[PDB]
Amino acid sequence: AAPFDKSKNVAQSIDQLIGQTPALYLNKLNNTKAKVVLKMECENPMASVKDRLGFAIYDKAEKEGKLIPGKSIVVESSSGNTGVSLAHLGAIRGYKVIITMPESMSLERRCLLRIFGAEVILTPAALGMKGAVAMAKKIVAANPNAVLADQFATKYNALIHEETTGPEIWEQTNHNVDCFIAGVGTGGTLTGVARALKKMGSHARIVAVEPTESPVLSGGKPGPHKIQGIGPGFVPDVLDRSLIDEVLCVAGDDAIETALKLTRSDGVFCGFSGGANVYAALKIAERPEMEGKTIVTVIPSFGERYLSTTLYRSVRDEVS
Amino acid sequence: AAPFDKSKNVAQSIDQLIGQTPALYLNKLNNTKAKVVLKMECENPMASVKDRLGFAIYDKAEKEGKLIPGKSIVVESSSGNTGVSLAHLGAIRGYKVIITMPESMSLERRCLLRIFGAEVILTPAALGMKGAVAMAKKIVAANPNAVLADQFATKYNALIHEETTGPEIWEQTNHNVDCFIAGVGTGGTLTGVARALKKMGSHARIVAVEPTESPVLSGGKPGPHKIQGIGPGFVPDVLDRSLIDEVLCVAGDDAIETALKLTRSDGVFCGFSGGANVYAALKIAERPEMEGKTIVTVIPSFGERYLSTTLYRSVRDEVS
Numbered sequence A, B: 001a002a003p004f005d006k007s008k009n010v011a012q013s014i015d016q017l018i019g020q021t022p023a024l025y026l027n028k029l030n031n032t033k034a035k036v037v038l039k040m041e042c043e044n045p046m047a048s049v050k051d052r053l054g055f056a057i058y059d060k061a062e063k064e065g066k067l068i069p070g071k072s073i074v075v076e077s078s079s080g081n082t083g084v085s086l087a088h089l090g091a092i093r094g095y096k097v098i099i100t101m102p103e104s105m106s107l108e109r110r111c112l113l114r115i116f117g118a119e120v121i122l123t124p125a126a127l128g129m130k131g132a133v134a135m136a137k138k139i140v141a142a143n144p145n146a147v148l149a150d151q152f153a154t155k156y157n158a159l160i161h162e163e164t165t166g167p168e169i170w171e172q173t174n175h176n177v178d179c180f181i182a183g184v185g186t187g188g189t190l191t192g193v194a195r196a197l198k199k200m201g202s203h204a205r206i207v208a209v210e211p212t213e214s215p216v217l218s219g220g221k222p223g224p225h226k227i228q229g230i231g232p233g234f235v236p237d238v239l240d241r242s243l244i245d246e247v248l249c250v251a252g253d254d255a256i257e258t259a260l261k262l263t264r265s266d267g268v269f270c271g272f273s274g275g276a277n278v279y280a281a282l283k284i285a286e287r288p289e290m291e292g293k294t295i296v297t298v299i300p301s302f303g304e305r306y307l308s309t310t311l312y313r314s315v316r317d318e319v320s
């Protein structure tokens, strides 16, 4: 992952286009005295931050001798972006990929993976995401060539963000970050950017966002919620809590409202978690102590993947 | 549009992220003795090459005094990417946008525009795209503040590709292009890149692609076809035919097959026209005279916009 000016050279493979994403000031929606900078992970080649984790898993596991193309089978339970990035990169790298997900998932979630030739294993609807996780573990337990991508525990996750996401942010902001805010899914983005920032001498406050309706890091009970991509309902092993200065809860409805406003104000088109992250950033930006300071957050995924979800239903309903 | 390393700076607005897109060698799908380079326009912020035309229209028309935010109303007939890019940029720039399209268009085509607050005017299904074009002209004729985006005639279209797309290609290929191939929609991409290449001293052969089922440039009759984004059924005023060395017809089914293969071979995920363009590139690449030469083509738009179209139906059917 050495820097590589995409705008001046021809890549030998699409995985060289992952990361080195743009950064963008929040402008019309930012009515505060603080700068808000959006790390545009929606601009990755398969349109989300999980492209960095997918690449890290194939790249680093192959380099360590743990994956062998044409022999290893990569397995994961995912109804979201990790599955997509695994299916995408697995195809070009010559791995069989198996993704498990409940039978009740939308046609779009299943069809996107099958485009890249992943095998999708549908689990009983009534068993929910737990039934998909169980099926993935059983597959890996039974077959010696089948390995779990292990997104919530893998050491590669925080590392890739430490090596790439965080240093890009550091360069883009000209070494000036007063607060870094990110919703925690696997915790990789938050943990790895916080490590890089700290090694650089930054005093940035590190803020983890989680859904108000599943406030686990806050000491509450796990619960179903709307903010796809964060709030896994347990504390993931990837996450290093020691680095977090503040856990901020954002309600699913504030995330949804914010995503809808962002498209029309700033032309940023994203999913629920980018709505939650910007809502959190604007909330921090309002605090009088943040006057003149620079807050960085992340836009994790591009909006087009959500057109069929509850995120844009208010527009769907209006359109009908 | 001066060069601006997105990977090292923070943009003040999302329209600074348009253009300066990556380029990528075709690898597993390329079994020839020629290099094939893909200009990745699917990596634009709203996921297609029309982001460059949208920006050119607002930017240049405002600079010339022809558009005034909050006064001018931008109007276009589009069931595709031009509407999206106009709706996107109009929102952030403070223009009312009206897009006309037949009533029979998918929920996704209508809902995407309404996300950016464009007004969508649905025209009678039986009148087809002609009825949408007529409604746009009538709106512009009747209202002095309403102006047509005029995608098929506007002088801004070839110009933006001459000023940006073509010079990026020239830098990325280290001033070495033996053939440039592009499907003609408005003709802007082909015309403007061919001009830039010629001004640079390139001897590249310029190849226009059109659908076999609507072979208008070839002297045939217009007809309905599958390859969304090209083959408008007339010769657009933007297109300068004098620059074209060869018109190559590609069948809709070859475009569809090629798009499906590209995802699994090279991880390139695009629409029908990127399928057609790569099919054409591989066809040229097979000619014995092209041994060791570099062919450039374009991937116009990202695949996610097509999940609901006939492009991926073979996977949709398999998934069901």
Ligand SMILES: [Cl-]
Residues within 6 Å of the ligand: A270, A271, A272, A273, A274, A275, A299, A300, A301, A302
């Ligand atoms: Cl998101």
Ligand SMILES: [Cl-]
Residues within 6 Å of the ligand: B270, B271, B272, B273, B274, B275, B299, B300, B301, B302
């Ligand atoms: Cl395309």
Ligand code: NA
Residues within 6 Å of the ligand: A043, A044, A045, A046, A047, B042, B043, B302
């Ligand atoms: Na992309």
Ligand code: NA
Residues within 6 Å of the ligand: A042, A043, A302, B043, B044, B045, B046, B047
């Ligand atoms: Na994008």
